[PDB]
């Protein structure tokens, strides 16, 4: 074969890359995503829920053969897992922030930062709406252009692709290195939702409440002028009227009513929410709506399987890029360990039932090592290797030992 790609990569139509489609964002498009996020309401809460499902349950670092890595770091012994857990103390927050940004925006992006001594401080995220990548004819990022508000002006600069890092969940293709904003991708559905909310709110004011209509004068009789109606308005004034006010009139005064004209705004809200949730790939229940015949049995099993599958795909996509673009470079550049090691970052399942896991362990624990049980049950493994590697429970080995 060949040491370089020989298919082309459909990117640079001659603009920033090409201007017709979601591959090109100005700083204005980026600030539109920011405006959708910061403007609150149901849209912002739903995309914040999407981040919480994908990344909110926290994470765990694994290295295959971690014990074999045992090394004196600074007189103190560590494994690579122990070094990484110390290098990234608050990784749960970082994963949730980056993973959130990588759902909203086309990419999460950030720097590596150092202690004055040259020791690793942190992977420092940057505000993604402030930054756009510049990429080559084969779609790889070569530089980053940044625009930022200062004193009402816009301090602006360009940075190399070498010392930033970036992560893309929403790839347009396996070759895409720039990604898609789901907010821009579904912009029409967002605007439809907001416009129907505004339409309902205005319609409730006009039509949700009955309104009093006093008609004055006999039909085909003497006309009544505005200065005449002013005196009638003084009598039936809703400002000074009370709940149990009574009226006495001649035959030529009629207190008509504009009734509240019924419309099913509940059904309109449900339909809007059904569109928006599905467009964002959330389950309908996240919108406080729900549906008939769908709350139980195999229909429920399916929608929850689809949701967990979507979460797994995003989690793996994030995991691999964070290891390859952040962790391995940090190990290589600031750690005494081998950066080519089999590091995995895994993110927890948000919708796992511990009671289902407990049932499984009761049913088939006799085929699982104590280590595998500790893994499934989300516990530290036993301190003694045979106790971890064995299949009969550690409490059974203790009572068997007490039998000597």
């Amino acid at each position: 074969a060949s040491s370089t790609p020989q298919t082309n990569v459909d990117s640079m139509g001659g603009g920033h890359s090409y201007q017709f489609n979601g591959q090109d964002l100005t700083f204005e498009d980026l600030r539109d995503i920011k405006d959708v996020r910061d403007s609150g309401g149901q849209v912002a809460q739903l995309m914040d829920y999407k981040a919480l499902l994908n990344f909110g349950e926290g994470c765990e670092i694994h290295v295959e053969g971690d014990d074999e890595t045992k090394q004196l770091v600074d007189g103190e012994p560590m494994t690579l897992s122990e070094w990484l857990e110390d290098a990234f103390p608050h990784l749960d927050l970082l994963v949730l922030d980056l993973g959130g940004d990588a759902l909203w925006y086309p990419y999460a992006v950030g720097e590596i930062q150092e202690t004055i001594t040259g020791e690793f401080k942190e992977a420092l995220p940057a505000e993604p709406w402030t930054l756009m990548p510049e990429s080559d004819a084969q779609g790889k990022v070569q530089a980053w252009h940044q625009r930022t508000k200062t004193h009402g002006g816009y301090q602006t600069q360009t940075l190399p692709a070498d010392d930033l890092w970036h992560i893309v969940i929403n790839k347009a293709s396996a070759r895409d290195e720039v990604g898609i904003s789901e907010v821009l991708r579904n912009k029409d559905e967002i605007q439809a939702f907001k416009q129907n909310e505004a339409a309902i709110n205005q319609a409730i004011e006009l039509h949700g409440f009955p309104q009093r209509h006093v008609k004055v004068g006999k039909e085909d009789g003497a006309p009544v002028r505005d200065n005449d109606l002013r005196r009638v308005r003084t009598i039936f004034d809703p400002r000074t009227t009370d709940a149990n006010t009574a009226y006495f009139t001649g035959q030529d005064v009629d207190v008509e009513t504009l009734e509240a004209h019924n419309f099913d705004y509940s059904a309109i809200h449900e339909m809007d929410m059904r569109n928006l949730t599905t467009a964002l790939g959330l389950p309908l229940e996240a919108g406080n709506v729900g549906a008939d015949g769908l709350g139980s049995g195999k229909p429920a099993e399916l929608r929850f399987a689809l949701l967990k599958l979507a979460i797994k795909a995003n989690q793996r996509s994030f995991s691999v890029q964070f290891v390859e673009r952040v962790m391995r470079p940090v190990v290589r550049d600031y750690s005494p360990f081998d950066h080519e090691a089999d590091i995995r970052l895994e993110i927890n399942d948000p919708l796992e039932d511990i009671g289902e896991v407990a049932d499984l362990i009761q049913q088939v624990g006799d085929y699982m090592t104590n280590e595998q049980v500790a893994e499934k049950l989300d516990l530290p493994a036993p301190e003694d290797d045979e106790v971890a590697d064995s299949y009969r429970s550690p409490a059974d080995m203790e009572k068997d030992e007490a039998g000597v």
């Binding site: 640079m12 139509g13 001659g14 603009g15 920033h16 201007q19 017709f20």
Partner: protein, 282 residues
């Protein structure tokens, strides 16, 4: 059943200037190429006499790239109701119109400012004309490596028995494959052929263009039908504000249901050494 989802193409002109010239991707819309003076001869002198100066003098060829543009505007009612993607079609047309633009700028410079001419006066218009035109350039101490050719000239050349007979060409490729024959790009010491279209040269009949000095063609007394030249001594200078090359932008109107596509490029074309080039005349 559904109607035919198709459009039949119009005439497409031949685009060669990027290959057939030295291309400069300029950093500025205006600029200069520096040129050294010709070689001279060291002068005779007596013993003990002062050596007189005759140092290298310099000048420049200025480039002054002109924004070629092409644009289109269509209503969204039309765009939505179209048989095919109207925006893809207008993109392809806009891109083609700018490549044609480059080729017009290139060919008009190439034909007008070539400093040598071989007048065939009818007669031996085939290989002998190419060899004679190489002779005209060689007589100014440059060596050409490329030729640019009109459709009429091509037709004459491929009727020449020296190319059309396998005995005389040493291969039957010209008889079989005409213009695509490898000998056609490897003749009289020229290692490239650049087949032009007839409409390419600037007659001044096209809107917004004011014509060149010559007639491009090879079918009447005095037409220039080919140019034999050094490819490294004719420059096509391309400038773009937002990249290396032609930029297409998608306009959408702030108020109306209107969308459009607009292309631009800045191009100039200039000889470094116009003596390195000869036209062939009917």
């Amino acid at each position: 059943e559904q109607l035919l989802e198709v459009v039949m193409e119009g005439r497409e002109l031949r685009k060669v200037a990027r290959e057939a010239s030295n291309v400069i991707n300029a950093n500025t819309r205006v600029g200069d190429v520096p040129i050294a003076s010709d070689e001279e001869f060291a002068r005779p002198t007596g013993q003990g006499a002062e050596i007189r100066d005759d140092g290298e003098t310099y000048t420049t060829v200025a480039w002054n790239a002109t924004k070629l543009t092409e644009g289109s505007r269509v209503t969204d009612e039309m765009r939505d109701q179209a048989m095919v993607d109207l925006i893809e079609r207008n993109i392809q047309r806009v891109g083609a119109s700018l490549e044609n633009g480059i080729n017009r700028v290139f060919l008009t410079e190439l034909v007008d400012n070539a400093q040598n001419n071989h007048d065939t006066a009818g007669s031996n218009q085939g290989y002998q004309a190419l060899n004679s035109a190489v002779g005209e350039v060689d007589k100014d101490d440059f060596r050409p490596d490329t030729y640019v050719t009109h459709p009429d000239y091509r037709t004459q050349l491929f009727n020449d028995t020296n190319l059309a007979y396998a005995n005389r060409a040493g291969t039957n490729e010209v008889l079989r494959n005409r213009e695509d024959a490898p000998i056609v790009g490897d003749i009289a010491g020229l290692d490239m052929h650049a087949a032009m279209s007839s409409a390419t040269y600037d007659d001044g009949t096209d809107i917004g263009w004011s014509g060149g000095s010559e007639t491009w063609g090879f079918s009447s007394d005095g037409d220039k039908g080919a140019v034999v030249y050094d490819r490294d001594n004719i420059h096509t200078i391309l400038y773009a504000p937002n990249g290396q090359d032609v930029e297409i932008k998608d306009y959408e109107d702030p108020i109306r249901d209107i969308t459009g596509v607009n292309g631009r490029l800045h191009v100039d074309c200039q000889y470094s050494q116009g003596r390195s080039s000869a036209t062939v005349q009917y």
